[PDB]
Each structure stands twice: as structure tokens, then as C-alpha cells.
Structure 1
Amino acid sequence: DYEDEFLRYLWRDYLYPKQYEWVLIAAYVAVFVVALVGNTLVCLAVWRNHHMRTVTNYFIVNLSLADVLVTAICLPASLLVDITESWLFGHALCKVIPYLQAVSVSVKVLTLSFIALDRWYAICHPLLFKSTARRARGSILGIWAVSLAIMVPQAAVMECSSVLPELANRTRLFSVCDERWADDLYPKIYHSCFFIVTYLAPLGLMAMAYFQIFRKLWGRQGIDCSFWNESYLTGSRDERKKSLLSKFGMDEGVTFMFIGRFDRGQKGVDVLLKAIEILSSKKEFQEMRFIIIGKGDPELEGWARSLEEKHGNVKVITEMLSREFVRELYGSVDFVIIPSYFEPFGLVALEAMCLGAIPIASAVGGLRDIITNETGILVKAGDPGELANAILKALELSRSDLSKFRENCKKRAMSFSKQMRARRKTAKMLMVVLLVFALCYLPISVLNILKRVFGMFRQASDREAVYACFTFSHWLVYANSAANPIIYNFLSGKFREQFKAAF
């Protein structure tokens, strides 16, 4: 009967050294040093510099502290156990160290989850985004409490054993540390639940969040503020406007301009032409000048040219223009009209506002976010009557100064063209953090759900291969904590500044 008994009696002193022990050691030591130092720096940057103290960065500090815990405690024990195949610490640590590992996993996952949630409101629902440092402190304490409470079961089940259970002879060369379960099926439940809780579900939810985030952020990387600025224009706006109107063949007046595709139902030139017809009566039409620029279907080009022929203060341009002359136009006219129906970005508003042109535009899409109070006139889309009223309001305003109004336009457009860059880069960094985490913990999660549920990894030569696989998976799990500070290095100048500050 006694095969295991006797073959262990024979083969127990059969120590087999591995060829690349020094490689594994070098790997874990590199990780130890890099992770420890880098997470120290991540904490110090936020703790010294007041401008680093953002909710995002507080959660990142939590991540780094969990990483430091793991690096300080569990990495050495894993190295020793993966080198010697024996548990060289006490029975108490056999419970404590795996407990701390599980808790750190929990904390890292929950912290990434709140980071994703905060960014999700801030980007996808900015009006509902009520977030402060008080909320973050409370949330972090809750994360730690829940993580500590929920991983007590592992600490309970870990045990240090050696010889065969139920064996009279207790002679041994070493003892090991593994999970002791009195139930033969509930372990499957535990490890399934903890695969799903600590990995699957939170990663899927954060994937949803970041999909929606990056979909709100596509195509939003600002305008070239170094090209769109008055610095390359000559003279004063008065002389520039006089000169433009003289080149086109008009006397000085309040100039409105539209540039865009002659599209019916999108860029809204039809609405502008109809509003020009509405204003062709009245009395104040004589004080106004309009320029209409673009290309499209024959109907709208023809109707624009008809209005040009009818009225001497209306000019139409279908020639192909350089970006530089568009710049000069924006810095010469008085207002710009954007009668679009579905404008999703509003690059025209930004480009024209950085040059001082005041925007009159439909209250749709990106425009509503750019054009605020004290910096433009907003109109119900598709209504040429309200557009005519807006033009008349612009005229009444033009009988005054407007200079500070244009400077406000400039400030707004420059701040908006730089905030979305910051959003884009922050989101990129956090997505990369999440990806590194999700890959680092994929192998070992798969291996545990297989070992603990679908009976495997216990037979034939599937015992040396298993050794190699788990050794690598452990190392990778720990390399996570060296990787995250490296991400922070490369993808945020705000941390690079303070990594330099230390030397």
C-alpha cells in the first residue's frame, strides 16, 4: 500500500539544484530595490509639493504604500521559498505573510477602482463630480478596513505542515506552508470568488469606465497655440479690418465671418444665408458687413453668390486659402459665426478666439463647453430668427469697446486648449498603470483558479514545469511594484520634476 511513504523515505535527501539560481536572485533583488526606492519617491513627491496634492495622486500614494508593504515583507519570503522549496520562517508567518499579500492585492485593486471612478465622473459627468480630499481620506480608510476584514479567511486557513498527514514517523528535513481546508469543495468557492472579486469584475468595470473616458476624449488634443496667436500679425485690428474690407471692396463696418463646409444640416451655412435674408430688411443691416467662406454643393454656393450680387456688403470666398490667411482673417474681423447643427469639436471657435474674434455660435456640442458667459453669444441651433437677433446683439455691442471681451476670449480659448491635453495625458498614464497591473497578476490568478478548482498541476513531469511557472508568476507579481513608479516617471513630468529634486 505505502508507495508515498517509502518513496519519500528514499528520495527525501534528493536535493536538485537549479541551473539559474543567481538569475532569479538578481531579478528579485532588482525588483526589491527599484520598487522600494521608486514608491518612496512617489510618496515624497506628493508629500513635499502642494501642487501634487490631487485626489488622483492621493490614491496613487495609497498604491505606492501597498507596494512598499509587499516589497518589504513578501518579496524576500517568496525568493527564499522559490529557491529552497521550503518554508524557513515560523508557523505564525505562514499565516501572516500570505494574509498581507492578499490584503495588498485587495488594496491595489480597490485603489485603481476609485481612480477609475473619479476620472469617470470628472470626464463623463462633470456636473455630478463632487470630489474632495476629505472623501479620498475616508475612501482610503474604507479600502484598508474592507481589505483587512475580507482576507481574514486566508490567514485562517494557511498552515505549516511537513511529513505526510496521518503518519507516525515525523522525521523530516524541512517544512512547508500551504492552505489547509477541512472542506474539499469550499476551497473551489473561495478561489473562484477571489479570482472574480480581486481581478475579473473590477478589471471589467474599470475597462468600461476607461472605454467611456477615452471615447469622450478622442480627437481632443487642443490647437497649436504657437501658430494661432496675434504675434505674427502687423498693425492694429482697426487697420487690419480697414485693409481687409478695402481688398474685398467694402467700406468700414462691423464685420462678421463664417468659414466652413457649405453643408445643409451640419455646418449650418443655410441658416446663416436665411438670417442674412431676414436682415436684408430692417435698417441696421447697412452697418454690417459679412464674409462667407467655403465650398460645398451647388445649391448653397449659388444662393450665397445670389446674396453677394444682391447686397454690396456681402462677400463670398470659394478660393482655397492658406492657414496663415485664415489666421489673418480671424485677427481682422469683429465676430465669427458658427451656425452648425452638430459641431462636435469646435476647433473654429478656439482658433478664432485665440486671435480675438468673438464667436457667435449655435449652442450644440463642444461649442457649449468652450463658449461660456462673458466670452460669446450662444443661439438655439437651426433657428435663423434667433441667429438674426444674435447678430443684432453683436452689433449693439460693437457700438461700444469690446477689447477686454476679446482678451477674455483669448484667455478662455488658451486655457481650454491646454486643459484637454492634461486630461488626455492623465488618462493615458492611468490606463497604462491599469494594464501593467492586469498583466502582472494575470498568470498567477489563472494558475490559482486552475490549481484550486479544476484539478491539475499534481501529476507526472507536470511538477518541474509547475515549479518554473509559479516561480516566474511570483516574480512578475512583484515586478508590478517596480513598474508603476517607472510609469509615473515616463508619463508625467510632474513626477519627473520631483524625482530629479531628490538629487
Structure 2
Amino acid sequence: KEWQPAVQILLYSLIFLLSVLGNTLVITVLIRNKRMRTVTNIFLLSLAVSNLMLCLFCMPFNLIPNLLKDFIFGSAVCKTTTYFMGTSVSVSTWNLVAISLERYGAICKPLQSRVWQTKSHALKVIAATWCLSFTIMTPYPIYSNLVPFTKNNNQTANMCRFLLPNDVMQQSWHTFLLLILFLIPGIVMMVAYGLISLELYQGINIFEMLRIDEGLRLKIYKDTEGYYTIGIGHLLTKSPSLNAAKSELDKAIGRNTNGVITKDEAEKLFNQDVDAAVRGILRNAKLKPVYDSLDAVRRAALINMVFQMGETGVAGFTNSLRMLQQKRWDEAAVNLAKSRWYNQTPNRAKRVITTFRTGTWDAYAANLMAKKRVIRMLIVIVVLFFLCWMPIFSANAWRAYDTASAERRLSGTPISFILLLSYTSSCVNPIIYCFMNK
């Protein structure tokens, strides 16, 4: 009528600007900063390229013809615009699947999913996504043609239309898209983000706690006391000799290590350490009573201490050990910070003490809080993707099954806005990235 074209020009041109500006920004930032190019962002970089492709090679050749009600570009543009639209949706859907699968590797199988975290594999997947997406979509250029129709005053026009040899094939193709663009990617990412979510809920434990407090040094080093240490805080000898640490090292890893161990030997060593700390708590007649009275989070604070100072040194925390057993957490927290231990390693001690005072992991939660944030962003991106793409795919499927119904309900402004919703998905992720560093 009179307004509809105005709102269309408005919304289309706005969504074009945001999507062009938004995605080229995301690309130029990522191309600029080598520090930014993580595995997850290399995918979000392949995602932002498909969003740019959809935005420049399809959107004008949809608003302009839908605004004029006449596809006035060539038969080639008609095959091109349909080709890139389906290629884009495919690349995007399988980029989102790759992301869910790499975060699953990182969060759920960290020391077990080593290759899924190589940038070389990441660019292998990205290449296989674009190549296969152009391949399975070749029906669109093969079977899309100008379809002549006639307007008001018997005025010939064309519409760009995708027509397969019959109805069984038109309907088979939509079953196809249903499967490899929604069902199969949908469950893959729902199982994945579901497992990721389970893990992230179970939260911090003694191992993650000691990994934050100790770190990883592959080569022999000295701690705050000046003692020779390796791996994840593994004390080698109190003696000042370096020859003796190197000896106690080779004996513990079983090979002539030459001062240097692997990450895999550090974790094996570190697992024996947490084992040994916990056995020392159980075998010591002063520590075991306190331990049993402790809740699992505080148990881990007691283990944290015993891991740093040994069974016997901690068992001599007689006045703090008593307060803990009596559930006097504030008293214990105040007393423990008057100790020499506090004075030697304040930052670590302040955390362990916070754990004792509150019974929570707040002291160690920062990193977990970051992973949870990213994961919730990714689940939001996936849900806004499907919500932006279900309508147009459902309108094409309904056309292939009952074209007369589909066209009478959707032909005017509804499919105009349904198409608009599609392009909106390509300007969604940059806006999300903006609201993420708030």
C-alpha cells in the first residue's frame, strides 16, 4: 500500500548497514590481532564471512525484486543469489557445529581431545565446510530460473524461482535440508552444549584449585621458599643441591629426564601428589578428625594446605585446626592469616582462607565464570540462528507441499518480513559481540 514499501526500505537498508559494518568490523579486528585468533574465533571468522556473503550477494537481489515485484536482474543473478543463500546457511550451520564440538573438546575432554584444538585442524574443517557447502547446494543454480508471470495491466514480469523436475523431488529436497541443516546439526549441538553445561555446573575441584595455585613449570624451578620444584608444584628436595633435585626427579618420572619433563608426566606426578596429600590427611591423627567434620569444599582447602606444606607442617596448625573443627570459620580465617604461611604466600593463602571462611569457590571461580559466559553467548547465537532461518525454510517447504495454501497466506507482506528475518541473522552476532565486553 503506502507505508509497507517505506518500512521495507527502512528495515532492509538498516539491516544491510549493520550487517556490512558489523561483519567487516569483526573480520578486520580478527585479521588485525593475532592474539585474537583462537580456534573458536577462527570459526566465528568463517561465520562472519558467510554473513558478509549472504549480505552482499543475496540481500539486494531480494529487496529490490520484492520491492518492485519483478525480478529484473539476469537469469544468472537469479541462480547466483539462490546459490549463495543456501551456501551461506550451510557454512554457518556447520561452523556453529564445529564450535560446539571444539568447546566440547576443551571443556569436557581437555587432556584427551588434543587435536581438535589445533589451528591447523580448524582451517581443515573450515575448508571442508565451504567446499562441501558449495557442492551440496549446486541444485540451486541448476534448477533456478526466471519464471514469467503477468501483472495488473497484462504487463510481463519475471520472478526468480527454484523448481525441481516434479513434486516428489521438491519435497525430497526439503526433507534433505531439514536433516543436514537442522535435525542433524541441532541434536549434535544440543548434546554437546548439554554435556559442556553439565561439566561447567559441577564446577571447581581440588585439581583445578591446585592448578590455579601451583601452575605448570616443565623445567626445574624454585618456589617461594627457594626449594627445588617441578611440574604442578612437585617438591623434589629441600636440600640446596641442584644435582640432588635432578636425581630425585629422574627417580620419580622413571627416565633420565635431564631437568625437563612433559606435561603428561607432570599430570601423572600431580595426581600422585593430590593422592599423597589426601592419604596424609587420613593417616594423621590430628588432621583426620577435622577432615571428617569438613564439607567437600573445605576438605579441598585442607588438602590444598597439606599439598603445599606437608602432612606434618599443617598438623601443627593446632589453634586453626581446632577452630575449623568447631565450625568457627571467621575465627579460623583471621587466625590463619596471622601465620607465617600467610606471610610467605599471601595471594594463595588469601584464596585458601576465603575457601575456609565461606565454604565456596569464589576465590577460584574467575576462569570458570569466563567459560560459562562464552558458552551462554554461543547458545544464544545458535538459538537466534535457528529462529531467524526456520521461518523461510518452513515457508519453502510448505510451498512445495501445498503451494496454493502457502502462497495465499504468505505472498504479500508476510514473506517480505520472513525474508527480512533471514538476513537479520547475519547482523546478530556482531551486535552480540558488542554487548559482551560490557
Tell me the TM-score normalized by structure 2: 0.67
- Say if 1:43 and 1:221 are closer, same or farther in 2 by CA, change over 3 A: farther
Q: 1:252: which partner in 2? A: none
- 5+ residue gaps in structure 2? 206-212, 214-285, 304-311, 354-360
The superposition leaves residues 82-107 of structure 1 with CA deviations (integer Å, 9 ceiling, x where unpaired) of 22222111011111110110000101
Q: 1:151: which partner in 2? A: 137
Structure 1 residue matching 2:435: 3-state secondary structure: helix
Alignment of 1:97-108 (within 5 A): 97-108=81-92
Say if 2:392 is the partner of 1:444.
yes
Q: Is the 8 A contact 2:167 2:400 kept in 1?
A: no
Say if 2:39 is the partner of 1:55.
yes
Note the C-alpha offset of 1:268: 7.5
The superposition leaves residues 160-199 of structure 1 with CA deviations (integer Å, 9 ceiling, x where unpaired) of 12149xxxxxx75211111222223111101111122112
Q: Distance in 2 between matches of 1:286 and 1:137?
A: 51
- Say if 1:215 and 1:18 are closer, same or farther in 2 by CA, change over 3 A: farther
Note the C-alpha offset of 1:334: 7.7
Say if 2:437 is the partner of 1:489.
no
Which one-letter code corresponds to 1:36 in the other structure?
A: V
Q: 1:22: which partner in 2? A: 6
Q: 2:350: which partner in 1? A: 355
Q: Distance in 1 between matches of 2:93 and 2:431?
A: 19
The superposition leaves residues 40-68 of structure 1 with CA deviations (integer Å, 9 ceiling, x where unpaired) of 11011111112201011111111111111
Q: 1:327: which partner in 2? A: 333
Q: Distance in 1 between matches of 2:334 and 2:4?
A: 68
Q: 1:139: which partner in 2? A: 125
Structure 2 residue matching 1:51: 3-state secondary structure: coil
Q: Distance in 2 between matches of 1:143 and 1:73?
A: 19
- Say if 1:92 and 1:356 are closer, same or farther in 2 by CA, change over 3 A: closer
Q: Is the 8 A contact 2:149 2:159 kept in 1?
A: no
The superposition leaves residues 426-481 of structure 1 with CA deviations (integer Å, 9 ceiling, x where unpaired) of 1122111111111111211222222223x25448xx62644222111110110111
Which one-letter code corresponds to 1:158 in the other structure?
A: S
Q: Distance in 1 between matches of 2:130 and 2:86?
A: 12
Q: Is the 8 A contact 2:287 2:315 kept in 1?
A: no
Say if 2:421 is the partner of 1:479.
no
Note the C-alpha offset of 1:327: 3.1
**Residue in structure 1 matching 2:326, options 314, 318, 323:** 318
Q: Distance in 2 between matches of 1:262 and 1:286?
A: 17
**Residue in structure 2 matching 1:79, options 63, 83, 101:** 63
The superposition leaves residues 369-397 of structure 1 with CA deviations (integer Å, 9 ceiling, x where unpaired) of x9xxxxxxxxxxxxxxxxxxxxxxxxxxx
Alignment of 1:456-475 (within 5 A): 456-458=403-405, 463=408, 465-475=410-420
Say if 2:101 is the partner of 1:95.
no
Which one-letter code corresponds to 1:199 in the other structure?
A: F
Q: 2:165: which partner in 1? A: 182
Note the C-alpha offset of 1:70: 0.9
- Say if 1:354 and 1:117 are closer, same or farther in 2 by CA, change over 3 A: farther
- Say if 1:136 and 1:87 are closer, same or farther in 2 by CA, change over 3 A: same
**Residue in structure 2 matching 1:204, options 168, 187, 197:** 187
Superposition RMSD in Å: 3.8
> Computing the radius of gyration over CA atoms, which structure comes out larger, 1 or 2?
1
Say if 2:364 is the partner of 1:423.
no
Higher percent of residues as helix: 2
Q: Is the 8 A contact 1:106 1:198 kept in 2?
A: yes
Structure 1 residue matching 2:157: 3-state secondary structure: coil
Alignment of 1:190-269 (within 5 A): 190-218=173-201, 220=203, 262=293
Structure 2 residue matching 1:212: 3-state secondary structure: helix
- Say if 1:264 and 1:67 are closer, same or farther in 2 by CA, change over 3 A: closer
Note the C-alpha offset of 1:421: 2.2
Note the C-alpha offset of 1:315: 6.9
The superposition leaves residues 289-312 of structure 1 with CA deviations (integer Å, 9 ceiling, x where unpaired) of 54687xxxxxxxxxxxxxxxxxxx
Q: Is the 8 A contact 1:42 1:64 kept in 2?
A: yes
Q: Distance in 1 between matches of 2:352 and 2:296?
A: 25
Q: Distance in 1 between matches of 2:313 and 2:94?
A: 63
Q: Is the 8 A contact 2:341 2:349 kept in 1?
A: no
Q: Distance in 1 between matches of 2:58 and 2:107?
A: 37
Q: Distance in 2 between matches of 1:88 and 1:484?
A: 32
Percent identical among aligned pairs is 24
Q: Distance in 2 between matches of 1:55 and 1:140?
A: 11
Q: Distance in 2 between matches of 1:27 and 1:258?
A: 69
Q: 1:309: which partner in 2? A: none
